[PDB]
Amino acid sequence: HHHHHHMVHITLDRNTANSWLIISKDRRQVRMGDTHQNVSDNKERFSNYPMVLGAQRFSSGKMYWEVDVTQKEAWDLGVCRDSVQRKGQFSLSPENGFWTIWLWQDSYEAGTSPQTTLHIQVPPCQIGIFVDYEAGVVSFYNITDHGSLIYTFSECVFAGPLRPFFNVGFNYSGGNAAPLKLCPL
Ligand SMILES: COC(=O)[C@@H]1C[C@@H](O)CN1C(=O)c1ccco1
Numbered sequence: 001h002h003h004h005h006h007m008v009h010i011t012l013d014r015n016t017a018n019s020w021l022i023i024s025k026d027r028r029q030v031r032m033g034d035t036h037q038n039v040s041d042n043k044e045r046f047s048n049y050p051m052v053l054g055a056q057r058f059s060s061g062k063m064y065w066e067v068d069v070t071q072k073e074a075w076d077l078g079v080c081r082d083s084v085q086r087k088g089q090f091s092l093s094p095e096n097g098f099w100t101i102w103l104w105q106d107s108y109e110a111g112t113s114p115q116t117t118l119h120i121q122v123p124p125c126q127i128g129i130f131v132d133y134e135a136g137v138v139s140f141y142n143i144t145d146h147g148s149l150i151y152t153f154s155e156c157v158f159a160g161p162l163r164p165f166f167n168v169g170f171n172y173s174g175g176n177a178a179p180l181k182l183c184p185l
Helices: none
Strands: 021-023 029-032 051-053 062-068 075-081 098-104 107-110 126-132 137-142 148-153 162-167 180-182
Touching: 075 126, 075 137, 098 148, 098 162, 107 148
Parallel strands: none
Antiparallel strands: 021 029, 029 180, 051 162, 062 126, 062 180, 075 098, 075 162, 098 107, 126 137, 137 148
């Protein structure tokens, strides 16, 4: 792809994080802690899952960023509406305001309803995410495999400002402690 020139500098919003997450000083990395991280509760925090939003809000234009997923067993990545539900149980779908892909149990899937199987020959260590607000497109790229396309959501109905979306996943296995990292431009 040739989307690299739309690169944006994403930082994580500490106030939206699940209370078990640990965000680095530079706000560019996030991992699952082994306990509650001693923060107060607020209406922004994702309560049920290890999720956090980017600070940046997008309502126009073309945006591109990259995320490092090295050695993780499970994660979700993409964008979501600013007004997504924070509390309780929900599914990641465009009807609920999410445009996402994930890794789970050794398979990659796009967060459609129902979910769509992805076809990845080279397990990615870094993911590229491209949003074209006006066109209604969210695309995912395999940086490890020379930028090959993973998935395109088209005909997106954003219906609001968008935020970068992250889920570091649970670590029930002891094999999913590694962080998500925003990669340098
Ligand atoms: C890009 O490849 C990966 O991230 C793979 C996917 C999954 O099989 C876990 N994994 C590891 O490499 C890993 C987990 C713990 C130590 O290494």
